[PDB]
Structure formats: C-alpha cells, structure tokens
C-alpha cells in the first residue's frame, strides 16, 4: 500500500501541472482571441 500510494502521488503530480498548462493556454488563447477581436474591432472601426 505504501509503495502504491507513492506512485499514486507521482501520478497526479504530473497531471496537476498539466492542468495548470491547460488553463495557461486557455488564458493565452483568450488573449489572442480577444486581440484578434481587437484588431477586428479596429478593422471594423478603423
């Protein structure tokens, strides 16, 4: 049980950072989508 729990910890250790990465690029693609909409707002405006 002890060894299994150790490896279990290691398992979610990776995927937690991966979740952080997912939300990270969610924010980045929100920045780029909002900025594409921003240049599109300038395209429509300017």
């Amino acid at each position: 049980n002890t060894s299994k729990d150790s490896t279990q910890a290691m398992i979610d250790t990776r995927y937690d950072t991966m979740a952080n990465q997912w939300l990270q690029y969610e924010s980045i693609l929100n920045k780029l989508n909002q900025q594409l909409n921003t240049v599109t707002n300038m395209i429509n405006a300017a």
Binding site: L32, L36, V39, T40, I43
Partner: protein, 31 residues
C-alpha cells in the same frame, strides 16, 4: 423550393493559421 432550406447557422468554423492572419490583414488593408 418546397425543400429550399438550410440546416444551421454557424461561425468560427476552423482553426487559426498565420495564413488566415495574412488574409485578414490584406482585407483590412484594402478596406
């Protein structure tokens, strides 16, 4: 025309590419 109809209303269908960016840039430049 009794069957003249369309299925849906859509947007944003696709993936961003630098090529699309260039096309948008050209369109803006024109207009």
């Amino acid at each position: 025309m009794a069957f003249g109809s369309l299925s849906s209303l859509g947007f944003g269908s696709g993936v961003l590419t630098q090529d699309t960016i260039d096309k948008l840039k050209e369109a803006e430049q024109k207009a």
